Design a protein around this nucleic acid. Structure first.
Ligand SMILES: [Zn+2]
Ligand SMILES: [Zn+2]
Ligand SMILES: [Zn+2]
Ligand SMILES: [Zn+2]
Lengths: 511, 48, 102, 48, 214, 96, 64, 49, 45, 88
RNA sequence: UGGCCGUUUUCGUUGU
């Protein structure tokens, strides 16, 4: 559903007509794994059969296309590919058959599965780890740098939970060196930084009073006022939305000469979208974005005031574990984009002939199947032609030298921190690990401290719909930001969800 | 554990560098310590 | 696509079969002739893909002698040679021929 | 002892002289000119 | 006379732009279709023609009178590298970008097509149509030893000997002219209709075996 | 000679060509092409581009780790083996 | 110190690329541009946050 | 016969052993050189003398 | 001359390297060879 | 041809289960047609020279692509002796 | 009747 439509057009003039080909993606169909011999004979396949014959426990998939034609003078169940299935999962033969049949089917009742098979090699997925998304962290940079504090945030769309953009606020200036302590923001798809005040103005709050009240919620904290004052001092050449936006668009990393005609809208696009995408993308909701910027800068300054500690980059609560689910999701998305572009190109060099395509010579299901097969075959978690620069070692031959070894191998973790530069913060243990990872287990040598193991009562969140949650919050008197001001709600409790500010409330304890 | 794992490689590197540096110094008959070219580093090895 | 020997216009063989040459069907008789005549007047081989849309003043159009020939795909070079019958018929009607193969 | 009989006298290396190659030197030493990208004559053995 | 048609300053300018490799023909036809569709519209495409020469692979030229005209002639094309890599052309070079640019009977030629690729021959007879040329080859036949081919399992070559084919495996037409399975064998030499695309007549470097035989 | 660039028999009868031999052949191709520009239309720009390509081949043939610019690959996408690699690193001829 | 920048900007009028120099004069808050073929120049006040891209864009807007 | 082994052998000051361990128990080879250019290019045919 | 044994129906038969590799009786596609006839020894140690 | 022995194969080229194998012994004799008599080359699969035991269970089925596709599970028992490893 | 030929490159896991 991410890209549910393919669209073409034809302003054929030879009599001017606009012929539109619009292909729509519909429902997905999944099948139980099935063998098809070279003889054309087909039969439901079983794991043991696979191991014996170097097969692949895979479920061919059928997707519902929808071919449509729109001429203006002014599909079916399509076989797309084969997804390997993890044994004992809901979509494997063995979920049924109870124990007695397993003996018939030559699979030990003890083996808990949980792994895939490809060419007869029992490959396993080592769950990876990543820093939590939609969260604000503060890092002091090294002394030999005009940057003193950094407020990095990696935003990812809640739906899917996929990386979109990464943003940083850098507190420039040194101690009586660098003159005033200017704050210059960094934005996506640009080659140069921008002052904070400029982005405040270009997003709707042009006047200084609104800007300072949004950033600051402690008026008596004169230090904040005087430390952001240099930004105010330099933030006077810009006084309206428009020159601010053009300033942004004048450094849009785009072509040269997009003029004030289209450059302003380029800036408005790069501001509405590509910026804090996890919050929103529609117009008329810049209030949320401005409030979030204000919170970010307030926290950054507070860290710059040493009134609170910088978050520990090894803190586990800020760490998230990627299981097989999302990993396969991302790989499938890459293969899906490739398939979509394949179909679009075939439409290009088959529609001009105006020959009705069969949706069968076009869709090359070989792409998905070969891609997934090779990816899990070598673990090079990406397309073959980009073997280099590809996260490696995420799929490995399962170890069955003993039952306990196999049990451990299926609860392993990993860290994508590499080894170029030893350091010790990533490798060492931490207090937060209490009751979530084994304080006793880890390999030896280069990986010592990286590869972890979940405790004996660990559990991984799969995600729940937040819409009922917000409904409850909204059901319970939460006060939107549009009724928020530092003066009034100086003791009311801000409310956050999934890392995104989502309201204001005064009496939280009952809530 | 981490400390040992880190220290071993660094010690190996330092030992390699040193060995490469002094690898050519030898003691001739005259009692003077010269590298390949003939530079004299100690006129009497170790001063004894 | 087969390029007409005289004007150089190249269009799908179905176009010549159903409509002849856009410029030379009046003198070459491609639309209402046998397949041999069309094939010899339009060989599958051509070179110099020149996309001409404006020719009344285009320098290249004058160069190739396609200023009068309707703008389109024209063949700078064509291999082979026409039979004797087509050349003789064209010379009879006032059309001295010049292959563009160069 | 491993090598067969050879008439040339046997001695050791004393000096190594570095320095580039004069193109006439290369021509004086090369025994062939390379002109054919096709390594294998016609896939009929006997490379070109 | 083409000599009095030489270009001038008042003739339209030309810019040579790079596009996606191999899809130069696609970009050329896209340009033609845009010009034909935008011919006379309120914003007509200000070009005279677009052309590509095979030797200049990846290079596309559009005849316009302003840089933005070339930009919009190449705009809206995915088969073009997004860069506006265009370079002007000298007056003498304008005609050099459109210059178009040895098959005789008894000429030693080699084959490249099908099973008999890489075999030198003599061109025998050229059809009137001018697309197929007869060749004189040394057959590579198996005399019904394994009949119950490609360019990698093929046995060696040898002139047709009628006696061997008679003894092992044949409609004699004339003295030395044998029709054997749709193949013409004159005086022991293989004769077949070879498409001119399948043969090489220029730049043939005779080999040791050819000196021994030819 | 081949002594320095022997070929790898992937599976006995199947023989694959040394990457150095491929780079040598590609340099020969670029050279031959550079020969056949002056005898036909050579609108300056083409000659310069082809010259740069030949220089690029002969360079990556002798160092595939030239700073600042992308490396050369095989049909497999893996970076080429220039002689500088053959001599440097732990596995160079010296330390190897 | 005046910097003479031979930026890759193209000139609108003389149909030549890299024939445009967007000189910087911050001393008096003045913009200067030098062309190489038609030698045209553009003048405009510049502030601390203005850059050759900004001068070029303002020049384009003025020309149109 | 890694670096460190070579260094230990040097330290024990055993020359000839190190020589042969790196010569006869490894790629022992013979060549010819021209005394003028000093290079190995001398084309020789031993049996042909 | 070269006996076999099915993995699904466990009925014996043979083949002469020309028949397709399938069970004659139940059609199954997994087979095993059977024990040789020369004598097998163990020292029980 | 290899330097090892072939006699333990069957008449069709596979070794029967229950036969003892030794180092440098051929267990699977495969032949490749030679691109042009005497036009075949050994493509055997000799046992790892550092192993011994008895062949136990020979499998012979088609691959995904319909060619013969064999598997030989040789076995032996490891007696602890001088030079093993153990751990509490 | 001597004579006699078994890949590389990656990545992984481990071992001291
Ligand atoms: Zn015509
Ligand atoms: Zn100018
Ligand atoms: Zn010499
Ligand atoms: Zn059976």
């Amino acid at each position: 559903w991410e890209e549910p439509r393919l669209i073409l057009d034809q302003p054929a003039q030879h009599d001017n007509i606009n012929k539109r080909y619009e292909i729509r993606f519909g429902k997905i169909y999944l099948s139980r794994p099935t063998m098809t011999e070279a003889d054309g004979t087909t039969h439901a396949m079983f794991p043991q059969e696979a191991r014996l014959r170097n097969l692949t426990y895979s479920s061919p998939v059928y997707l519902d296309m929808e071919k449509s034609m729109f001429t203006s003078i002014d599909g079916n169940k399509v076989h797309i590919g084969k997804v390997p299935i993890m044994l004992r999962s809901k979509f494997c033969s063995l979920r049924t058959l109870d124990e007695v049949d397993l003996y018939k089917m030559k699979e030990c009742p003890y083996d808990m599965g949980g792994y895939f098979v490809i060419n007869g090699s029992e490959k396993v997925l080592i769950a990876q780890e990543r820093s939590a998304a939609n969260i604000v962290q503060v890092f002091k940079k090294a002394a030999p740098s005009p940057i003193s504090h950094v407020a990095e945030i990696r935003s990812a769309l809640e739906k899917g939970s996929r990386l979109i953009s990464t943003m940083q606020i850098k507190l420039y200036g040194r101690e009586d060196k660098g003159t005033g302590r200017t704050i210059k923001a960094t934005l996506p798809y640009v080659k140069q930084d921008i002052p904070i005040v400029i982005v405040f103005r270009a997003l709707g709050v042009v006047p200084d009073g609104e800007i300072l009240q949004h950033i600051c919620y402690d008026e008596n904290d004169w230090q904040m006022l005087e430390m952001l004052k240099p930004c105010i001092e330099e933030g006077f050449v810009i006084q309206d939305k428009e020159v601010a936006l053009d300033f942004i668009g004048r450094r849009g990393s785009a072509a040269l000469g997009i003029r004030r005609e289209k450059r302003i809208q380029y800036a408005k696009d790069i501001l509405q979208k590509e910026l804090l995408p996890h919050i929103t993308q529609e117009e008329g909701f810049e209030t949320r974005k401005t409030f979030f910027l204000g919170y970010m800068v307030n926290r950054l300054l507070l860290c710059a005031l040493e009134r609170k500690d910088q978050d520990d980059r090894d803190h586990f609560g800020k760490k998230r574990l990627d299981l097989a689910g999302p990993l396969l999701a991302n790989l499938f998305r890459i293969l899906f984009r490739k398939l979509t572009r394949e179909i679009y190109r075939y439409m290009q060099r088959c529609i001009e002939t105006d020959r009705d395509f069969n949706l069968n010579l076009a869709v090359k299901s070989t792409t998905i199947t070969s891609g997934l097969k090779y990816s899990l075959a070598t673990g090079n978690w990406g397309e073959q032609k980009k073997a280099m620069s590809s996260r490696a070692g995420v799929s490995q031959v399962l170890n069955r030298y003993t039952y306990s070894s196999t049990l451990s191998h299926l609860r392993r973790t990993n860290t994508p921190i590499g080894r170029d530069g030893k350091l010790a913060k990533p490798r060492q243990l931490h207090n937060t690990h209490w009751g979530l990872v084994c304080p006793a287990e880890t390999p030896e040598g280069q990986a010592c401290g990286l590869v972890k193991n979940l405790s004996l009562l660990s559990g991984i969140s799969i995600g729940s719909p937040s819409e009922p949650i917000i409904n409850f919050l909204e059901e319970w008197g939460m006060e939107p930001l549009e009724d928020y001001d530092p003066a009034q709600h100086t003791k009311s409790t801000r409310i956050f969800v999934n890392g995104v500010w989502t309201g204001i409330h005064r009496d939280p304890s009952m809530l | 554990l981490i400390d040992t794992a880190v220290k071993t490689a660094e010690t190996g590197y330092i030992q390699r560098r040193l060995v490469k540096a002094l690898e050519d110094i030898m003691v001739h008959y005259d009692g003077t310590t010269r590298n390949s070219l003939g530079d004299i580093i100690q006129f009497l090895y170790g001063e004894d | 696509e087969r390029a007409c020997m005289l004007c150089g216009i190249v269009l799908p063989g179905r176009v010549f079969m159903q409509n002849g040459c856009p410029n030379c069907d009046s003198v070459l008789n491609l639309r209402d002739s046998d397949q041999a005549t069309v094939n010899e007047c339009t060989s599958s081989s051509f070179e110099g893909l020149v996309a001409v849309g404006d020719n009344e003043h285009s320098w290249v159009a004058k160069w190739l002698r396609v200023d009068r020939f309707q703008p389109g795909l024209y063949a700078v070079r064509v291999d082979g040679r026409l039979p004797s019958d087509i050349v003789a018929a064209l010379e009879q009607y006032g059309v001295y021929y010049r292959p563009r193969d160069g | 002892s491993q090598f067969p009989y050879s008439s040339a006298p046997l001695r050791s290396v004393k000096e190594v002289q570095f320095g580039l190659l004069s193109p006439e030197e290369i021509r004086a030493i090369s025994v062939v000119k390379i002109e054919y990208p096709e390594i294998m004559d016609e896939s009929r053995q006997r490379p070109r | 006379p083409q000599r009095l048609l030489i270009p001038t300053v008042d003739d339209p300018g030309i810019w040579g732009v790079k596009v996606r490799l191999g899809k130069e023909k696609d970009v050329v036809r896209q340009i033609l279709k845009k010009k034909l569709a935008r011919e006379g519209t309120k914003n007509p495409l200000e070009i005279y023609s677009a052309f590509q020469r095979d030797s200049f692979k990846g290079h596309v030229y559009i005849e316009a009178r302003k840089a933005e005209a070339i930009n919009d002639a190449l705009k809206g094309n995915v088969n073009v590298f997004s860069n506006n890599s265009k370079f002007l052309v000298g007056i003498v070079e304008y005609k050099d970008l459109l210059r178009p640019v040895k098959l005789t009977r008894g000429s030693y030629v080699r084959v490249k097509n099908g099973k008999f690729k890489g075999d030198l021959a003599q061109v025998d007879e050229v059809l009137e149509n001018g697309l197929e040329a007869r060749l004189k080859l040394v057959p590579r036949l198996d005399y019904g030893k394994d009949l119950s081919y490609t360019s990698k399992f093929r046995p060696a070559q040898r002139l047709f000997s009628e006696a061997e084919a008679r003894v092992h495996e044949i409609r004699r037409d004339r003295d030395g002219f044998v029709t054997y399975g749709g193949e013409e064998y004159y005086e022991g030499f293989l004769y077949k209709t070879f498409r001119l695309q399948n043969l090489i007549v220029n730049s043939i470097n005779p080999t040791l075996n050819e000196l021994s035989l030819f | 000679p081949p002594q320095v660039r022997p070929s790898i028999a992937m599976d006995e009868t199947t023989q694959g060509q040394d990457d150095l031999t491929h780079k040598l052949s590609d340099i020969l191709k670029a050279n031959i092409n550079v020969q056949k520009l002056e005898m036909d239309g050579s609108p300056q720009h083409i000659i310069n581009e082809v010259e740069q390509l030949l220089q690029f081949h002969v360079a990556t043939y002798m160092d595939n780790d030239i700073a600042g610019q992308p490396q050369a690959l095989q049909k497999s996408g893996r970076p080429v083996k220039a002689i500088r690699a053959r001599l440097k690193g732990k596995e160079g001829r010296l330390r190897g | 110190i005046k910097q003479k920048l031979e930026t890759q900007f193209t000139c609108l009028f003389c149909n030549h690329d890299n024939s445009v120099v967007c000189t910087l004069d911050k001393k008096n808050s003045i913009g200067l541009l030098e062309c190489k073929k038609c030698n045209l120049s553009f003048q405009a006040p510049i502030n601390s946050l203005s850059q050759p891209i900004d001068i070029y864009s303002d020049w384009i807007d003025a020309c149109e | 016969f890694g670096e460190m082994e070579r260094d230990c052998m040097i330290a024990h000051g055993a020359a000839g052993f190190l020589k042969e361990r790196l010569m006869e128990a490894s790629d022992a080879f013979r060549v010819h050189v021209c005394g003028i250019c000093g290079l190995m290019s001398v084309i020789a045919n031993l049996k042909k003398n | 001359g070269v006996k076999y044994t099915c993995g699904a129906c466990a009925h014996n038969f043979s083949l002469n390297k020309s028949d397709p590799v399938r069970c004659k009786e139940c059609g199954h596609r997994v087979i095993y060879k059977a024990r040789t006839k020369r004598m097998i020894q163990f020292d029980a140690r | 041809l290899k330097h090892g022995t072939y006699e333990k194969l069957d008449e069709d080229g596979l070794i029967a289960p229950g036969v003892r194998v030794s180092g440098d012994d051929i267990i699977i004799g495969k032949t490749t047609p030679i691109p042009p008599y005497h036009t075949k080359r050994d493509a055997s699969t000799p046992l790892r020279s550092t192993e011994n035991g008895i062949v136990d269970q020979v499998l012979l089925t088609t691959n995904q692509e319909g060619l013969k596709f064999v598997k030989v599970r040789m076995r032996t028992t490891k007696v602890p002796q001088i030079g093993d490893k153990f751990a509490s």
